[PDB]
Amino acid sequence: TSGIVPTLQNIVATVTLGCRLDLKTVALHARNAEYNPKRFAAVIMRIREPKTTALIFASGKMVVTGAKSEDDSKLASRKYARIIQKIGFAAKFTDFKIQNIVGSCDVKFPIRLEGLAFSHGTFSSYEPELFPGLIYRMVKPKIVLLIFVSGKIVLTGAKQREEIYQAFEAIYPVLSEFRKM
Amino acid sequence: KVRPGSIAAA
Amino acid sequence: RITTLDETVGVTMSHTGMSMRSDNSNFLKVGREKAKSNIKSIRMPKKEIL
Amino acid sequence: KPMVNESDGVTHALYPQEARLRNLTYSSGLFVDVKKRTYEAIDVPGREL
Amino acid sequence: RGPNLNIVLTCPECKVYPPKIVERFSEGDVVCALCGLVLSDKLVDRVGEASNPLLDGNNLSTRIGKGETTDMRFTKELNKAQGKNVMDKKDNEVQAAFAKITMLCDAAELPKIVKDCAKEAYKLCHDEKTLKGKSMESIMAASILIGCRRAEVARTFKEIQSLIHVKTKEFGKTLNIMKNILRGKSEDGKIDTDNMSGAQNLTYIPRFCSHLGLPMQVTTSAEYTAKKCKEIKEIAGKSPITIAVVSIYLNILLFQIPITAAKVGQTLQVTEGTIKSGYKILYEHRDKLVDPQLIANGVVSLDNLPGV
Ligand SMILES: [Zn+2]
């Protein structure tokens, strides 16, 4: 009905290796590493071809972010695992789960945030003195949407590409009902 | 045992 | 004799109670003074600290 | 001068007639200048500061 | 799930159900309106103490104090013994929270209704799993904000922060949790109206204009300007504080009151750059931001508004 498919900006994925790593050695022998114990208890590294950032902990846990697609995230995680293997630590690809999906879109018209906050008061939370965007907590699917006056919608919380599309399709009518002028 | 004779081993 | 303010009452009271303006005084800022400083440390191996 | 602050936070001059009609206290605000000083000294043991 | 123990007054002779009953208070009688038969006579209309079962529930307690003749030893020992009560300890926390709320509201010069509503909100939202890791300062500030909004005297986040030392993140999180709790109890066991909305920039304008010392005519003009300012999409997204401040500044320069933006922003704690920027957006629609009655009467025209 809407005719516009929201585009996924970010992908947060989690992977495990099952082996203990030496952060000092990884930092010294890695091209792009940032090991600051005072700052954080993990090594921050980044790769360019996928344009992604990975946080690697001493417990063998890796958190990949920045991927624009599920297969791109898979490729980035595989390359990270290969980099660690080349470093020498016993790292094997294991459970890779996407824990967060972020998407964006625009409805191409202004939206009455006060009207939405009054009509749908069980799901919306509008406090314009802190953030200039209404927060809508859709219950099914369980997702959080940020609605702005400029007609831009940000979706976050989905674990799969289906949930975010379903949420946008379910929120489009109530958004259209509250168009300014 | 994690590192077979590698740079990590050194 | 005591001094009487001839200014508007609202203007005189603008500094009282819940006012938008935030205090810029630095007096008795013990909480700030001791909270600004903070440093942490890592678990160096036991064999050295021992 | 005698003043009254309303519930919404608006303050305006109050006259005896309005005070009587509205059951308001005919009173004026008191203000005082306050000076906040802080001294410090090196407390060498066994000596006056 | 219990005995009836209910008395219903009906006229045996008339048999009409429901009956027409008149309560002659002066004569102390309850009489059937149709036949005049008396159903109950000798009806009843400091020795006690009053309490509000909305902020204190059911909790009867008495203090110990000096009399016409008393020894300080007995008073001190009795107060000490009374303090060491386990059952009363649980509600003493709520009472102390009420005392601190009262102190904050009184120092804020807020009306009695505001602090009563704040205490009610605190009591309703207290003793729940959701609010267990948040600071009591944040809880109290959120309750005070909710009460102020419920009393149609809504204050601002910065104004409440001026008294309660709580950062914005904690304050907003606690406020959202409290609002969710109130909604949940309103459904299961009203609470909100048009006032519950967030922006409600109209309520702020009178107090800001009072702080600046402007006349009520300028205040009304600023209210109209702010009300019509929401029609512009380039400004509707701005903070309500900024919207109200910019409208007030526009009306100030409309009436040529010798107050500069440097002082307006200093008094209302808003950046002068922000004020002038908002004025730039509103200058392109000045025509829709001025009262037709004012411009027709001629107190001032569109001319008295310098544009950059
Ligand atoms: Zn009868």
Q: For E216-251, give the DSSP string.
A: HHHHHHHHHHHHHHTT-HHHHTS-HHHHHHHHHHHH
* Whether A41 and A119 share a structural domain: no
Contacts of E248 (CB under 8 A, 6+ apart): E205, E208, E209, E212, E214, E222, E226, E264
Give the whole-angstrom CA distance, residue A146 versus residue A137. 9
> Which among E27, E29, E28 has a CA at the least distance from the CA of E37?
E29
Token pair belonging to A88: 């020498």
DSSP D3: E
Q: ∠E118-E245-E279 over CA atoms, to 5°?
A: 155
Which contacts qualify for C36-44: CB closer than 8 Å, 24 or more apart? C39/A38, C40/A38, C42/A37, C42/A38
* Cross-chain Cβ contact E213/C19 below 8 Å: no
* Whether A47 and A105 share a structural domain: no
> Which among D11, A54, A134 has a CA at the least distance from the CA of E199?
A134
- Please state how this structure was obtained: cryo-EM
Q: Domain holding E284: CATH number?
A: 1.10.472.10
Ligand 1 centroid from CA E5, angstroms: 24
SS3 string of chain A? CCCCCCEEEEEEEEEECCCCCCHHHHHHHCCCCEECCCCCCEEEEEECCCCEEEEEECCCEEEEECCCCHHHHHHHHHHHHHHHHHHCCCCCCCCEEEEEEEEEEECCCCECHHHHHHHCCCCEECCCCCCCEEEEEECCCCEEEEEECCCEEEEEEECCHHHHHHHHHHHHHHHHHCECC
- State how far Cα E243 lies from the chain centre: 23
* Whether A18 and A84 share a structural domain: yes
* Whether A2 and A39 share a structural domain: no
Out of A20, A88, A90, name the one closest to residue B7 (CB). Answer: A88
Is there a contact between A124 and E196 (Cβ–Cβ < 8 Å)? Answer: no
Residue E214 belongs to domain spanning: 201-297
Token pair belonging to E176: 């959202």
Please report the beta strands in chain E, taking only residues with DSSP state E, as ranges in sequence order: 21-24, 29-32, 38-41
Is there a contact between E20 and E46 (Cβ–Cβ < 8 Å)? Answer: no
Give the whole-angstrom CA distance, residue A38 versus residue A141. 39
* Cross-chain Cβ contact C28/D36 below 8 Å: yes
* Whether A104 and A85 share a structural domain: no
> Which among A91, A37, A82 has a CA at the least distance from the CA of A59?
A91
Give the whole-angstrom CA distance, residue E253 versus residue E225. 13
SS3 of residue D5 by DSSP: strand
Assess E303–D contact: CB distance below 8 Å, yes or no.
no
Report the largest interatomic distance among the alpha carbons of chain B, rounded to a whole angstrom: 14
* Whether A28 and A104 share a structural domain: no
Question: Can you say whether residue E145 is alpha, beta or left, with left for phi > 0 and alpha for psi between -120 and 50 degrees?
Answer: alpha
* Whether A63 and A81 share a structural domain: yes
Of A98, A116, A148, the position where a domain reaches its end is A98
Of A32, A65, A98, the position where a domain reaches its end is A98
All partners of chain A with 3 or more CB pairs under 8 angstroms:
B, C, E
Structural domains of chain A, count: 2
Give the whole-angstrom CA distance, residue A153 versus residue A145. 7
DSSP E304: S
Is there a contact between A66 and A11 (Cβ–Cβ < 8 Å)? Answer: yes
Residue A82 belongs to domain spanning: 13-98
Q: How close, in Å, is residue D40 to chain E by CA atoms?
A: 27
Of A47, A82, A98, the position where a domain reaches its end is A98
DSSP D12: E
Q: For chain B, give the number of residues.
A: 10
Token pair belonging to A148: 């702005």
> Pairing between strand A52-57 and A143-148?
unpaired
Q: How buried is C3 (Cβ within 10 angstroms: 0-12 exposed, 13-18 middle, 19+ buried)?
A: exposed
* Location of structure tokens 């919404």: D8
φ/ψ of C35, rounded to 5, equals: -85, -25
Token pair belonging to E3: 């005995």
Helix (H) or strand (E) holding D4: strand D3-5
Give the whole-angstrom CA distance, residue E57 versus residue E54. 6
Give the whole-angstrom CA distance, residue A166 versus residue A155. 11
Helix (H) or strand (E) holding D11: strand D11-13
- State how far Cα A167 lies from the chain centre: 16
* Whether A24 and A75 share a structural domain: yes
Out of D12, D31, D38, name the one closest to residue C10 (CB). Answer: D12
Give the whole-angstrom CA distance, residue D4 versus residue D11. 5
